[PDB]
Structures are given as structure tokens and as C-alpha cells.
Coordinates of C-alpha atoms in Angstrom, one line a residue:
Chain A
X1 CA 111.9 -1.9 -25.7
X2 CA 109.0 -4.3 -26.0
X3 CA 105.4 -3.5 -24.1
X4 CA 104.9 -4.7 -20.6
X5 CA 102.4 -3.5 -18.3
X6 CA 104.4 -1.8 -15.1
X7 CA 102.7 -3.3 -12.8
X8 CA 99.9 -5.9 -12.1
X9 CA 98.9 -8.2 -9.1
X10 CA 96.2 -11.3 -8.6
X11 CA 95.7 -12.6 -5.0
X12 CA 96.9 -16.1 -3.8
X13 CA 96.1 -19.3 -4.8
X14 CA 95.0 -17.4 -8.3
X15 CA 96.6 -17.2 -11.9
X16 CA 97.7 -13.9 -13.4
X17 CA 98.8 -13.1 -16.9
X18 CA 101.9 -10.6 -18.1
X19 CA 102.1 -9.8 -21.3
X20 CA 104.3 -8.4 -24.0
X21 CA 103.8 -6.7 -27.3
X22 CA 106.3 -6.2 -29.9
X23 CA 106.6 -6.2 -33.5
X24 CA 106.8 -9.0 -36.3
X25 CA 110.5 -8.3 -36.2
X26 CA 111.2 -9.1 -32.3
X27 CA 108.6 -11.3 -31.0
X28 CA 106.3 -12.1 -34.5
X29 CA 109.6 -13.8 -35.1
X30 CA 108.7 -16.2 -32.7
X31 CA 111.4 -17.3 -29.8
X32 CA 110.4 -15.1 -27.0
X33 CA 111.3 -16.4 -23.8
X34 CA 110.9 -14.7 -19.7
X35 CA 113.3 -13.9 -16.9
X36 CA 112.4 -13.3 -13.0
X37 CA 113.9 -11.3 -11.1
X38 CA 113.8 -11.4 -7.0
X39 CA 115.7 -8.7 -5.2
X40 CA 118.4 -10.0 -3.3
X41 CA 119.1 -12.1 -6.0
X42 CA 120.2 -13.4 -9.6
X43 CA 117.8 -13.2 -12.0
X44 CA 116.2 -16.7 -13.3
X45 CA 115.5 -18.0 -16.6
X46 CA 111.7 -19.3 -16.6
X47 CA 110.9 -20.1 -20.3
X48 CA 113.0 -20.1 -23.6
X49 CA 111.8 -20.3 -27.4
X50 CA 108.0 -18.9 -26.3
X51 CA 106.6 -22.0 -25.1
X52 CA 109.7 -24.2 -23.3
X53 CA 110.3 -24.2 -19.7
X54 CA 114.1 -23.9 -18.4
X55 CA 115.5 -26.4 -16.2
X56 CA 114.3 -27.0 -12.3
X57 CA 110.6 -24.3 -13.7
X58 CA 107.2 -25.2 -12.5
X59 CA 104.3 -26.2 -15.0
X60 CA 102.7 -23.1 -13.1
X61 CA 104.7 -21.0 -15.1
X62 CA 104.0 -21.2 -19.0
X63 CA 104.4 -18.8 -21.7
X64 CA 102.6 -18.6 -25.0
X65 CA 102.5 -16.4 -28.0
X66 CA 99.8 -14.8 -30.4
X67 CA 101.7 -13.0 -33.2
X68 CA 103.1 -10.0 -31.7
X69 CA 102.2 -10.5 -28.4
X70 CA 103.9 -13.4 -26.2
X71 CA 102.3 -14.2 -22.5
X72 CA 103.2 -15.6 -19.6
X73 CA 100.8 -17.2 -17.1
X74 CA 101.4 -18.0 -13.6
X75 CA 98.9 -20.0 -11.4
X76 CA 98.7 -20.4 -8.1
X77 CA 100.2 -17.7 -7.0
X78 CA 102.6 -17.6 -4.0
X79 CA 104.3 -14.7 -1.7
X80 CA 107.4 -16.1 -3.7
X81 CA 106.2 -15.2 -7.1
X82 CA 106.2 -11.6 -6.1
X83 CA 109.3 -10.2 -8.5
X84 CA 110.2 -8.0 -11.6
X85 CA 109.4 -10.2 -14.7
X86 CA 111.1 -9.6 -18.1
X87 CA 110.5 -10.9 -21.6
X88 CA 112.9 -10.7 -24.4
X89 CA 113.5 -11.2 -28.3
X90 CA 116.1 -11.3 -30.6
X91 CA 115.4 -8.8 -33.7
X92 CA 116.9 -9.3 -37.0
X93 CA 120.0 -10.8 -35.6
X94 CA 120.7 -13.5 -32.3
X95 CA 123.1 -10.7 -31.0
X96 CA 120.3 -8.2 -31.0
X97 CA 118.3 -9.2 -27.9
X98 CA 115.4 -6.9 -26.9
X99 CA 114.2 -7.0 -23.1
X100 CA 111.0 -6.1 -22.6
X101 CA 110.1 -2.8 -20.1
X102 CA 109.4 -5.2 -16.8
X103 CA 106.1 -6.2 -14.9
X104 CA 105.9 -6.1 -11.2
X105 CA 103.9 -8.6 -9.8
X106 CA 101.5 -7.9 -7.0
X107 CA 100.8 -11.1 -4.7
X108 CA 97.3 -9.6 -2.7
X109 CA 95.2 -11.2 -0.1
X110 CA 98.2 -10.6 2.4
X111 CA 96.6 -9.8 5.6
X112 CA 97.3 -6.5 7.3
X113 CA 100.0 -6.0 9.8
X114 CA 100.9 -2.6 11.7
X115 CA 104.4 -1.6 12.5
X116 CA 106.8 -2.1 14.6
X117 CA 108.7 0.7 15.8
X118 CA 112.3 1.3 17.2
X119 CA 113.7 4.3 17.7
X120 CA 117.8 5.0 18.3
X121 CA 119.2 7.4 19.9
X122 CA 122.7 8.8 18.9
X123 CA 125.8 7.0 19.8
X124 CA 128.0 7.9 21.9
X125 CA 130.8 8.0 19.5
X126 CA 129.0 9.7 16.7
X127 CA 127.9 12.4 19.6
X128 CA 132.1 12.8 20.5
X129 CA 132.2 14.1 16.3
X130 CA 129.6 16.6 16.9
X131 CA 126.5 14.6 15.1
X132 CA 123.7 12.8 15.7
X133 CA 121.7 10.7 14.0
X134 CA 118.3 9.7 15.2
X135 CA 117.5 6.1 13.1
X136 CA 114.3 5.2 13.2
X137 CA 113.3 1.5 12.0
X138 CA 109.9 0.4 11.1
X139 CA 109.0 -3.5 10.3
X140 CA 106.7 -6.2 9.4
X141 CA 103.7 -3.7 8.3
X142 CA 101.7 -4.5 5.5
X143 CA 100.5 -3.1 3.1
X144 CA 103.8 -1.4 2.6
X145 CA 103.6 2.1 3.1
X146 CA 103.9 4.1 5.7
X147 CA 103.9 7.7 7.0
X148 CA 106.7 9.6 9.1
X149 CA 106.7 12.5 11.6
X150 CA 109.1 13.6 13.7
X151 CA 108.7 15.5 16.8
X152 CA 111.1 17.3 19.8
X153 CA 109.4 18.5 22.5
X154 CA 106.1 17.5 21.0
X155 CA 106.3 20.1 17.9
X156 CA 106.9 19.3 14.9
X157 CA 110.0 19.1 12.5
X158 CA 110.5 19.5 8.4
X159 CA 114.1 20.0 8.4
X160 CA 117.1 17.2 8.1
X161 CA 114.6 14.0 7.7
X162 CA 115.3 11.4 5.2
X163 CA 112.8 8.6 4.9
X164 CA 113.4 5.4 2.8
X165 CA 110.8 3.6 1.0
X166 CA 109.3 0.3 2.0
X167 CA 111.0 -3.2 0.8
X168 CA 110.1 -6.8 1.9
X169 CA 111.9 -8.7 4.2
X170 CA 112.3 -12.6 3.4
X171 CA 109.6 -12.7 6.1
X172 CA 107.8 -11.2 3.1
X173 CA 105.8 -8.1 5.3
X174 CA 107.7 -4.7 4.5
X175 CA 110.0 -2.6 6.2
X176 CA 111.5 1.3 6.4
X177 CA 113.6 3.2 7.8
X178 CA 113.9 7.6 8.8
X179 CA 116.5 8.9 9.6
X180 CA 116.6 12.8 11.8
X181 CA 120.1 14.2 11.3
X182 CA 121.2 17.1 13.9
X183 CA 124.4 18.7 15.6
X184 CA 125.0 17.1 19.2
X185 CA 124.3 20.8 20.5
X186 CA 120.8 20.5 19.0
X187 CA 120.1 16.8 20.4
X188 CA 121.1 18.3 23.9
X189 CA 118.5 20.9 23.7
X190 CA 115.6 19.3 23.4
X191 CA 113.2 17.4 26.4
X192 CA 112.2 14.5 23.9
X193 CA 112.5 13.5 20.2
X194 CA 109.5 11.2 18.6
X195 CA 109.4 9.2 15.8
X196 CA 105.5 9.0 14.3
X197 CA 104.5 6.1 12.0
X198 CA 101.4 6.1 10.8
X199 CA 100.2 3.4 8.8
X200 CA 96.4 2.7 7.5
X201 CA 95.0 6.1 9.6
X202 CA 96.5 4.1 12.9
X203 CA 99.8 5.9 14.1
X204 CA 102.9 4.5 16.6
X205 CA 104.7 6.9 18.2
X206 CA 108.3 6.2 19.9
X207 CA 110.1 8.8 22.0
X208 CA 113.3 9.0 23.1
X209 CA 114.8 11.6 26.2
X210 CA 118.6 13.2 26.1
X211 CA 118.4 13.3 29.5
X212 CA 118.2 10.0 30.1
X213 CA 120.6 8.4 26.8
Chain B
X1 CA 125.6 -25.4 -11.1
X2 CA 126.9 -22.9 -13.1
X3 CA 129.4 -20.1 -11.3
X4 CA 129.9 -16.4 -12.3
X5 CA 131.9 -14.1 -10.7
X6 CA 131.7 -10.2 -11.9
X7 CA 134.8 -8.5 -10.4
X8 CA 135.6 -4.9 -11.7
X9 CA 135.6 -1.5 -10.0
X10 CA 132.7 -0.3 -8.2
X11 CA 133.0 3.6 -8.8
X12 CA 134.2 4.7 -12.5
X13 CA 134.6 8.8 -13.1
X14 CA 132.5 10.3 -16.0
X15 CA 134.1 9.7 -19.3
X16 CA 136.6 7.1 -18.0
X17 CA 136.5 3.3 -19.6
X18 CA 135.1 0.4 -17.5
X19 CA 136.3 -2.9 -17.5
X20 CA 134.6 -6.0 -16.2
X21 CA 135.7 -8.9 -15.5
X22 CA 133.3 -12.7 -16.1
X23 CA 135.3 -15.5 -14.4
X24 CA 133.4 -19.0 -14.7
X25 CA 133.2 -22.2 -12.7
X26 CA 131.0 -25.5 -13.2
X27 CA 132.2 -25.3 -16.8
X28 CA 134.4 -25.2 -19.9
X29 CA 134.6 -21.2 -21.1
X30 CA 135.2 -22.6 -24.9
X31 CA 131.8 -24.7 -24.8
X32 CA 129.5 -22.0 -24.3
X33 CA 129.0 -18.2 -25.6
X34 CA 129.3 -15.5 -22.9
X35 CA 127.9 -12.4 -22.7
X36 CA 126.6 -9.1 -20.5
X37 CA 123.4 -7.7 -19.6
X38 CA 122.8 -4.5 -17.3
X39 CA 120.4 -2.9 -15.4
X40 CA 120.0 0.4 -14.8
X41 CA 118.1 1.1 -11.0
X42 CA 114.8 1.2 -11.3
X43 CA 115.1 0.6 -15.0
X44 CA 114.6 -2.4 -17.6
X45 CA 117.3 -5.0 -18.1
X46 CA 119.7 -4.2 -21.2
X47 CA 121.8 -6.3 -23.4
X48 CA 125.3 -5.7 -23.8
X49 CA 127.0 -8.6 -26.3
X50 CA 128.3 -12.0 -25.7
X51 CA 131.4 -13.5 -27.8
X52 CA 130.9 -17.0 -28.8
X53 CA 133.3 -20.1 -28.3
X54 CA 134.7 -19.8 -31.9
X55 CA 135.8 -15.8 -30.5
X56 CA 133.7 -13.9 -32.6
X57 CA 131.8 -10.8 -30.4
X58 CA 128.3 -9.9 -31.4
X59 CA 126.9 -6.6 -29.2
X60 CA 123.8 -4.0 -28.8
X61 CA 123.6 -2.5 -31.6
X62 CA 122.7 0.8 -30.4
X63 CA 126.1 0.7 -28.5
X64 CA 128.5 -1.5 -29.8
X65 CA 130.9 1.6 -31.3
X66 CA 131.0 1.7 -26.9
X67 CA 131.6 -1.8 -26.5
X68 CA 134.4 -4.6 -26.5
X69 CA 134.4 -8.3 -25.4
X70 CA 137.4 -10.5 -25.0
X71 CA 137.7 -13.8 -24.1
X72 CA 140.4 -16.3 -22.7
X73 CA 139.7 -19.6 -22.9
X74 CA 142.9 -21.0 -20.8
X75 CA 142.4 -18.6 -18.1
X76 CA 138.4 -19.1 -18.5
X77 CA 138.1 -15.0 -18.6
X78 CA 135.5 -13.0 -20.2
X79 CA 136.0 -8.9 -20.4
X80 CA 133.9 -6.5 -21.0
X81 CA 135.0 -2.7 -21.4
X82 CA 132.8 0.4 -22.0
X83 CA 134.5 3.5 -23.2
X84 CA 133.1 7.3 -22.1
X85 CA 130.7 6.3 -19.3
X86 CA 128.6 8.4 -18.2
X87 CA 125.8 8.8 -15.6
X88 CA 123.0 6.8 -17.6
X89 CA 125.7 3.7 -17.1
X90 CA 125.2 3.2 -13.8
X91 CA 124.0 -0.2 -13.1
X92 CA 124.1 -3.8 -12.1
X93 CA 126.6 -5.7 -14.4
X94 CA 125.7 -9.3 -15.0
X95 CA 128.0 -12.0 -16.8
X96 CA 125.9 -14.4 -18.4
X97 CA 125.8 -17.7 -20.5
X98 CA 123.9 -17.5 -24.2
X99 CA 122.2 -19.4 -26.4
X100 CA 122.4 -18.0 -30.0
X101 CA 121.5 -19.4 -33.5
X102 CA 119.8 -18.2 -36.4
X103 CA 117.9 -21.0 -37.5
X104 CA 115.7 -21.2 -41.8
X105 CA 113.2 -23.6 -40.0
X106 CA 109.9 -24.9 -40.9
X107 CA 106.2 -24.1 -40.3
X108 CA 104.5 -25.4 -42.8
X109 CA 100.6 -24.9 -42.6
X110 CA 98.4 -27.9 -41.3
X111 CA 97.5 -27.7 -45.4
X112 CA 100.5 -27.8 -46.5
X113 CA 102.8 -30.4 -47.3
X114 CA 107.2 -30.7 -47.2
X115 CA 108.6 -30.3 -51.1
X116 CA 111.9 -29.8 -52.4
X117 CA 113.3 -28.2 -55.7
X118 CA 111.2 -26.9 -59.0
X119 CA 109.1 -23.5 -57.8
X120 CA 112.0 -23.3 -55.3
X121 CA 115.5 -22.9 -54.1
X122 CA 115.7 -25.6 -51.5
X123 CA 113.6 -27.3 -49.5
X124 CA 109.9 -24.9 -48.9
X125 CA 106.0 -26.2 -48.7
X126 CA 103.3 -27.3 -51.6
X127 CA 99.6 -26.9 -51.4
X128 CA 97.6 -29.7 -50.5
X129 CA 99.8 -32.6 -51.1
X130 CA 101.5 -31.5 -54.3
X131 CA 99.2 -34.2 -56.5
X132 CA 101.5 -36.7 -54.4
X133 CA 104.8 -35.2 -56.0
X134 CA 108.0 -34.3 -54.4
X135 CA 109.1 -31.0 -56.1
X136 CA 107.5 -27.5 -55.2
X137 CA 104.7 -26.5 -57.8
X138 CA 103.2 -22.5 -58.1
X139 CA 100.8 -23.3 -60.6
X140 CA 96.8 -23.1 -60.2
X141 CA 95.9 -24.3 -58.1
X142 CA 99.1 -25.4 -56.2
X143 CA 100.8 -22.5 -53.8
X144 CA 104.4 -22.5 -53.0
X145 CA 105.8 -20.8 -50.2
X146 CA 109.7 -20.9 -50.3
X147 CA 112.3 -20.6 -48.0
X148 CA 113.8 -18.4 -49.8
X149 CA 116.0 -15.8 -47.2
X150 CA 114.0 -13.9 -45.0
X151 CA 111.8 -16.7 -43.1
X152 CA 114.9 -17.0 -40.5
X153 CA 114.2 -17.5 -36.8
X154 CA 116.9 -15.5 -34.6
X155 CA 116.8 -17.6 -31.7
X156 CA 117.9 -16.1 -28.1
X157 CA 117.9 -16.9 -24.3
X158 CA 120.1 -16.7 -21.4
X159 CA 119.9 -19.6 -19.4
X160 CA 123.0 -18.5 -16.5
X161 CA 123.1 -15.7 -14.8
X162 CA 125.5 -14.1 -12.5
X163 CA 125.1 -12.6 -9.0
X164 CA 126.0 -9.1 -10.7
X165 CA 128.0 -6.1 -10.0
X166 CA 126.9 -2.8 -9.3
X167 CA 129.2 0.0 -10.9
X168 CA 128.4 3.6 -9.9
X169 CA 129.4 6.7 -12.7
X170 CA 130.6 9.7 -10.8
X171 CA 132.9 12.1 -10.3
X172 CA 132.5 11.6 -6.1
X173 CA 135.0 10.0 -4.4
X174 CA 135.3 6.5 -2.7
X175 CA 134.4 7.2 0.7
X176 CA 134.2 4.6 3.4
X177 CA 131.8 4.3 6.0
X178 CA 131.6 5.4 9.8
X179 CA 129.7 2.6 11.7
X180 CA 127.8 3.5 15.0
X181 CA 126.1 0.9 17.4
X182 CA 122.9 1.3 18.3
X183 CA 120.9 0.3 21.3
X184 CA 117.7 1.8 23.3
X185 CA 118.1 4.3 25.9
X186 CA 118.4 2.6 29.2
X187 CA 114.3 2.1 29.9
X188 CA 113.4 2.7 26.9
X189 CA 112.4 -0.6 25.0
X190 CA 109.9 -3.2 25.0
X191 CA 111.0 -6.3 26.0
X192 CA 111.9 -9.7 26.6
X193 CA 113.1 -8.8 23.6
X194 CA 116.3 -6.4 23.0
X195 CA 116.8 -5.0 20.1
X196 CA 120.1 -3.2 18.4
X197 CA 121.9 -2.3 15.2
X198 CA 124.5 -1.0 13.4
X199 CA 124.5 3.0 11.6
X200 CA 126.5 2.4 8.9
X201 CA 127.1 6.2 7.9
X202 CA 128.1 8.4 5.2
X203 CA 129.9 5.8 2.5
X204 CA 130.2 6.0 -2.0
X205 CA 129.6 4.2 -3.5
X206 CA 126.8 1.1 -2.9
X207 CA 127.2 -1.6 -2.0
X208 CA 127.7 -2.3 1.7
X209 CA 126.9 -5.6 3.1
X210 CA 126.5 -6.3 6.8
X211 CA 126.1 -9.6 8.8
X212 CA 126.2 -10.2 12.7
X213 CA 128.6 -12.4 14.5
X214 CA 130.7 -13.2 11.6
X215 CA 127.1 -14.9 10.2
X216 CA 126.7 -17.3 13.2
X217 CA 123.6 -14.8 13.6
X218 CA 121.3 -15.0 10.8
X219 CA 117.9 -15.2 12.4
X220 CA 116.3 -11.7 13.8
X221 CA 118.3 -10.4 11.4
X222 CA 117.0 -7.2 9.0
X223 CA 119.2 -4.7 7.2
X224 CA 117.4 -1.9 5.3
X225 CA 117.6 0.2 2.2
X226 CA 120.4 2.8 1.7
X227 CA 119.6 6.3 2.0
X228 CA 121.0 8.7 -0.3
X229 CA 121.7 12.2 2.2
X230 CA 121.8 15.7 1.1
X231 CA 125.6 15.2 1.6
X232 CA 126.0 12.9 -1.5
X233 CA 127.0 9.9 0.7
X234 CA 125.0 7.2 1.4
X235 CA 123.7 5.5 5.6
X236 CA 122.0 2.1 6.3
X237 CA 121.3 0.9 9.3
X238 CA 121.0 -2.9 10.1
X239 CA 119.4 -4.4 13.3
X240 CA 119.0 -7.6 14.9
X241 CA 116.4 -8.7 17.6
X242 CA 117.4 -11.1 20.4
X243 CA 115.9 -12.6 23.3
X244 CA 117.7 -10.6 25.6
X245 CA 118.5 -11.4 29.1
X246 CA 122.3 -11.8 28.3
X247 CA 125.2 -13.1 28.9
X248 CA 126.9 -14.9 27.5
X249 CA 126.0 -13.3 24.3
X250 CA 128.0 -10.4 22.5
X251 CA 127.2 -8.7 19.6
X252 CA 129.2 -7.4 16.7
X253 CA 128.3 -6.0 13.6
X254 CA 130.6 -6.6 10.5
X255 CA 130.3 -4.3 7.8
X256 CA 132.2 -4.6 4.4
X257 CA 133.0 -2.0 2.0
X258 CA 134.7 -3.5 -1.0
X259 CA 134.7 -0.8 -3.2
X260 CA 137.1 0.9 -0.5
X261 CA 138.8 -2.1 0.8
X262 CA 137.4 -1.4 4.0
X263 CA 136.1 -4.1 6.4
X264 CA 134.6 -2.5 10.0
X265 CA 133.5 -4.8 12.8
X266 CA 132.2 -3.0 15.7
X267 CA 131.4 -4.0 19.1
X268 CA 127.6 -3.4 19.9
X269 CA 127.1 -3.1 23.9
X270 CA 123.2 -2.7 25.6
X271 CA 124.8 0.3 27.0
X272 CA 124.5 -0.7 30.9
X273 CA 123.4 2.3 33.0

């Protein structure tokens, strides 16, 4: 696999440069060319034989190459450009292509955002087979990561929580979701159940009541 | 504005043989060379093979005694198959459209000039200009650098790319999902604004894809992540924020579930109370 950096970022309006560092028999051959790749969609050919731009690309995107190591540069930088970005290089045969180990790009400058909350209660229907499933959905905070704490009865709970990690949303802030999985006998039990975000040392709290849902 | 369509199953059991299926719209199958590249979650992208319009299949080398790629050019049909798969071949299948070809080219130096014969097989570069001659000389002081063999340029790039197909490895079974609406306690929200969703619950293997009011609802619109439970099955929950006030205005989730044949479109009510 050729040598990218994981991860690297550069704030808006700015250029940025990715590398990737092979050997004289992948890229020191000399037709490397880079793929992007946006979640939610297919990925996209930016430039071909190290220097060439595919069809419908940007001059802000160009690519260039120093023996081993090929480059590509992207000024002014936009939310958009935000994506996993792959070079690759045939070796010692066209049918032997060799992706490189993908960069994530970074688009900073974004200004912070808190959460928004919502907590669910169990349905009705789910409560009729005996679960319930407390969802709790966070949005639009940035940067993206958050915090989560449950509660019932104001004390706090370890057991049956499952958190997902933060992804954008094509408004391009992030977004999360927990999830609090009990019986229906437990969800009956309790006064209250709260769902605690916190996010940059500022938390949001939501609370739902059985007796009332 | 080049189509293609992976179809193929979505769940395959350990050691059982995959097949994938590439079919292609915009364009002639027998004017361009075809080929696969995964991804792994979370890992880098991985070539597979491609089989060129002439019908000869070139593949990974590293797994090609895995690997098999057909073609039918009436039918416009690519296959792929992968024998004995196992949990590292989980990942996003895309069909794609190659460029190959292994090119003896020339880079002669910016001292260097084009000659032809003499000091070498074919065509190569002299030193300075070769005392204004034509055929390659390697005595002092002239340099020759040959074509000889092994200056070829392997040239690659794909330049289509499919939407991909995610195929899960395990030994779990299909399982389609439960969906649940969800709205706020009654009194227990922060409007204008209401806000609901679907709990699309306990489902194998990915994807699920959910849109609202059969897509006439786009806007307001968020469906997150899957979680992976404890269970082995996977939930998502996808919500949409309205105005509010209502009515007219019903609300209905449709979730799909292809890999189980399983469509769900549930009725989402702001409870009433």
C-alpha cells in the first residue's frame, strides 16, 4: 500500500497538500493519478497519469510528482472538499494497481455550533413486545464530538447504552445518535429518563416522564 | 453519463463463493475494459481485476487464485466471483471502467537528442546532438541510453465508478427490521417546530435506506449512522423536522431492506393526548 498521511486539514479559503510515497516500481514509474471519495456517494476520479485532470475537475485540484513521491494540492478549500482522498499506481504490470492508504481531509475555520437535542420515548408498539428503546438524536454541533449520559430518576446509568459516532449531514455540521435499551417493566419504574449531551464543557439535558408518554 | 449497477447478494456465509454482478448503461461493454475495486470499512480502497474488451482478465495479484471475471458483451454483463470468503471480505463492491496500457515511451533528457539504430535496438536517445547523426552512438564522449525492455510505463486509472454494493461475510442470518414511530411525549417538545422519526430496529445485514412520504419530503430530513447492538443486529433511527401545526399533513416513513426483500412503510402519528 503506498504512504499517505491518515489525516490532515487546512482552514477555508486555503491550499493543503496530500501526499504519497511509494517506490520506483509503483509511483517512480510515473502515472500516478487521485480518487475522492464523499460518503453518501461514488467515488470520483480527480487526476490521471500524475499531472492530468479528469473530465468536469477544477484547476484547484492538481497533482504533481517528485520521484517517489506524487502530490496533490488543493486550493481554496471548501466544506465540499472535506472527503477520503486516494492515490494509486500500477506496479510492474497495468493489472496490478496499488491504492494508496487514504487521507482524510480536515476543512477548519467552521464556527462552533452546540447541539440540538431530542429525546424519544418508547413506542407504543415496541412497549406491547416487552422493549423499549429510548433514541436519543443529537444535531448540527460542531466540532463533531460529543459526550453522552444517561440518567433515571436523576442517577446515573452504565448499563444497555449504545452511542454512535458523529457524521456530517449535507448541512455539513455533525450529528449522533444514543440509544438506552430496557424491558417495558423497567421504563415503567422510573419517575424520569435524561439524555445528557455534553459538548465543548457546555451540556443539554432532555428528560422524558412514563407517566406522562 | 456513464451507469453502473452492482447487484449481487448482500449477506454471503464464511467460506461460500460470491458473485457480483456489473450491468452498464451510457455505453458499449466491448469498447471499454471493466473491472472491480473494494473497500473494506474503515479501510483503503483495493483492486480486484478488470477483463478487457478483447476478454482477457488481468486481477490482484495477491488474490487472483480467489478471483474470476467474465464478461458478456451482448447482454452487457460483467461478473465477478470470489471463492472462500471470509470476514476480511466484507466490503463495498464497486464496478468500474479502466484504462490500461503498458506504454516503451520517451523521456529523453533536455541534453539529449531522438536516435535510432547502431548502439541500439530501436529507437533510444544520443548525447548532445549525436555530431548531427541519426543512429545511436556509446562512444566517448557520446552516451546512449536505450530502450531496451525495462523503461516501460504501466499506465493505470479508473475514470467510472459505480454507486457500489456493500456485501457482509457472516454466518448470521438475514434478519429484517422492526420499525417504531417516534414522536415527543405529549408536552414535551420545543416548538413551532415538531419533530419525529422512525426506530428502524434490530435488522443484518446493512444497508437500510429510509425516505419520508414516498420522497415528496426531502427537506428536514436526517437519518443517522447504524448501530451495531450487543444482539448482533443492527438499529437506525431517521427523523424529520416540520413546522408543525398540522393538518393536512401525514407522515410516513418508508424503510427498505433489500437484502431481505422487505419494504416497511409505517404510519407516524404526533400521538394526540
Amino acid at each position: 500500500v503506498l504512504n499517505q498521511p491518515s489525516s490532515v486539514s487546512g482552514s477555508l479559503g486555503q491550499r493543503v497538500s496530500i501526499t504519497c510515497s511509494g517506490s520506483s516500481s509503483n509511483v517512480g514509474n510515473g502515472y500516478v493519478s487521485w480518487y475522492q471519495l464523499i460518503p453518501g456517494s461514488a467515488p470520483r476520479t480527480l487526476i490521471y497519469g500524475d499531472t492530468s485532470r479528469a473530465s468536469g475537475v477544477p484547476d484547484r485540484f492538481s497533482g504533481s510528482r517528485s520521484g517517489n513521491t506524487a502530490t496533490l494540492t488543493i486550493s481554496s478549500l471548501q466544506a465540499e472538499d472535506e472527503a477520503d482522498y486516494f492515490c494509486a499506481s500500477a506496479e510492474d504490470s497495468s493489472s496490478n494497481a496499488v491504492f494508496g492508504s487514504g487521507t482524510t481531509l480536515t476543512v477548519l475555520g467552521q464556527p462552533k455550533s452546540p447541539p440540538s437535542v431530542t429525546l424519544f420515548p418508547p413506542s407504543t408498539e415496541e412497549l406491547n413486545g416487552n422493549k423499549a428503546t429510548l433514541v436519543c438524536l443529537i444535531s448540527d454541533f460542531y466540532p463533531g464530538s460529543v459526550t453522552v449520559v444517561w440518567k433515571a430518576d436523576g442517577s446515573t446509568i452504565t448499563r444497555n447504552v449504545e452511542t454512535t459516532r458523529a457524521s456530517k449531514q449535507s448541512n455539513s455540521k455533525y450529528a449522533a445518535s444514543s440509544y438506552l435499551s430496557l424491558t417495558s417493566s423497567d421504563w415503567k419504574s422510573k419517575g424520569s429518563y435524561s439524555c445528557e449531551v455534553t459538548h465543548e464543557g457546555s451540556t443539554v439535558t432532555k428528560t422524558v416522564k412514563p407517566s406522562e408518554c | 453519463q456513464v451507469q453502473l449497477r452492482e447487484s449481487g447478494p448482500s449477506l454471503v456465509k464464511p467460506s461460500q463463493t460470491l458473485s457480483l454482478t456489473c450491468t452498464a448503461s451510457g455505453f458499449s461493454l466491448s469498447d471499454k475494459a471493466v473491472g472491480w475495486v473494494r473497500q473494506a470499512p474503515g479501510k483503503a480502497l483495493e483492486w480486484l481485476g478488470s477483463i478487457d474488451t478483447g476478454g482477457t482478465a488481468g486481477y490482484n495479484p495477491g488474490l487472483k487464485t480467489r478471483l474470476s471475471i467474465t464478461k458478456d458483451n451482448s447482454k452487457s454483463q460483467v461478473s465477478l466471483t470470489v471463492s472462500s470468503v471470509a470476514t476480511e471480505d466484507s466490503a463495498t463492491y464497486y464496478c468500474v471502467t479502466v484504462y490500461q496500457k503498458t506504454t516503451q515511451k520517451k523521456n529523453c533528457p533536455d541534453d539529449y537528442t531522438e536516435c535510432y539504430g547502431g548502439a541500439c535496438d530501436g529507437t533510444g536517445c544520443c548525447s548532445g546532438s549525436c555530431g548531427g547523426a541519426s543512429a545511436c552512438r556509446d562512444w566517448w564522449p557520446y552516451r546512449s541510453i536505450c530502450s531496451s525492455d525495462n523503461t516501460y510505463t504501466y499506465e493505470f486509472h479508473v475514470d467510472a465508478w459505480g454507486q457500489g454494493l456493500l456485501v457482509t461475510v457472516s454466518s448470521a442470518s438475514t434478519t429484517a427490521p422492526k420499525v417504531y414511530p417516534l414522536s415527543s411525549c405529549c408536552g414535551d417538545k420545543s416548538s413551532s417546530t415538531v419533530t419525529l422519526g422512525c426506530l428502524v430496529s434490530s435488522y443484518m445485514p446493512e444497508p437500510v435506506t429510509v425516505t419520508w412520504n414516498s420522497g415528496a419530503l426531502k427537506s428536514g430530513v436526517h437519518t443517522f449512522p447504524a448501530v451495531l447492538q450487543s444482539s448482533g443486529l443492527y438499529s437506525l433511527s431517521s427523523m424529520v423536522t416540520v413546522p408543525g401545526s398540522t393538518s393536512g399533513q401525514t407522515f410516513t416513513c418508508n424503510v427498505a431492506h433489500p437484502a431481505s426483500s422487505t419494504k416497511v412503510d409505517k404510519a407516524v402519528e404526533p400521538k394526540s393526548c
